[PDB]
Ligand binder design. Structure first.
Ligand SMILES: O=C(O)c1csc(-c2ccc(C(F)(F)F)cc2)n1
Length: 284
């Protein structure tokens, strides 16, 4: 079925939970043996969220190459994304090592450091220009260059230096700051505006490594971001945009990381975002 009318048909019939459970039943199951080794327990935020072995990002290190991060490679859309958990106190150096080694331009953050009164990820970037951060375990230096605070998101320019080689690179930090502590946003308008700002920066384009996207577990809000982006790109590429099947795209993405889209409310929100976004693209 088309999307917008399949949407109204699920609303009127109140069957979002049943649609979402079908997706969960059909989703791929692949091994994640490296994630579960005892030496990696303090590298995982949640025991039930792990990268598959076949698609996990490897650190370029001979001691321990493990990070909780996955490469989502979308062949028809010609987009790739790295989805990862919010960094932990003992993985902030690994996080920036990955950004460096994978040649990423941008980092997309969809959570606040504290939500619901608890810490959802480490304070992994510097908050003042004159107070830079050094990660001694991976030999990197990180400096805040500039910061632009808007009503729904903040953009930061960061400098990452590889202290072994003295090479430097500019990284863009895109921070969506207004996702509610409970539920999903009422309108997708600010999330879509945010997605378009990431796109306009070059961070999603083939001349760079894959964008790094995270929330707390790296599957829920993060899944919504890449699902909406890929569906809108396919609608632009194909002769028949009504042939884009959001449930099929989500199942393809779940071949590369488990659990993408965590609730039936997140599924409905993804439909809403793609539907509204397709009207703004045109060309109208
Ligand atoms: O209209 C359609 O349904 C349509 C148009 S292009 C397309 C398609 C393109 C590429 C690939 C892949 F090889 F890249 F995987 C798979 C499907 N489907």
């Amino acid at each position: 079925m088309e999307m917008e009318k399949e949407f109204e048909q699920i609303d009127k019939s109140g069957s979002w939970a049943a649609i979402y459970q079908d997706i969960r039943h059909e989703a791929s199951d692949f091994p994640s043996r490296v994630a579960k080794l005892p030496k990696n327990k303090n590298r995982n935020r949640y025991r039930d969220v792990s990268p598959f072995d076949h698609s996990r990002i490897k650190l370029h290190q001979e001691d321990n190459d493990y990070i909780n991060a996955s490469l989502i490679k979308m062949e028809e859309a010609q987009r790739s994304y790295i989805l990862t958990q919010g960094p932990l106190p003992n993985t902030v150096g690994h996080f920036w090592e990955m950004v460096w080694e994978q040649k990423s331009r941008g980092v997309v953050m969809l959570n606040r450091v504290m939500e619901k009164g608890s810490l959802k990820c480490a304070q992994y970037w510097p908050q003042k220009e004159e107070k830079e951060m050094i990660f001694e375990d991976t030999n990197l230096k990180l400096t805040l260059i500039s910061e632009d605070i808007k009503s729904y998101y903040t953009v930061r320019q960061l400098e990452l230096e590889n202290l072994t080689t003295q090479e430097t690179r500019e990284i863009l930090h895109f921070h969506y700051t207004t996702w509610p502590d409970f539920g999903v946003p009422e309108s997708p308008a600010s999330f879509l505006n945010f997605l378009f700002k990431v796109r306009e920066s070059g961070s999603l384009s083939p001349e760079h490594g894959p964008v790094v996207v995270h929330c707390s577990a790296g599957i829920g809000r993060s899944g919504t971001f890449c699902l909406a982006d890929t569906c809108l790109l396919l609608m632009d590429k194909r002769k028949d945009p009504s042939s884009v099947d959001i449930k099929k795209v989500l199942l393809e993405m779940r071949k590369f990381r488990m659990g993408l889209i965590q609730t039936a409310d997140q599924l409905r929100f993804s439909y809403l975002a793609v539907i509204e976004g397709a009207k703004f693209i045109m060309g109208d």
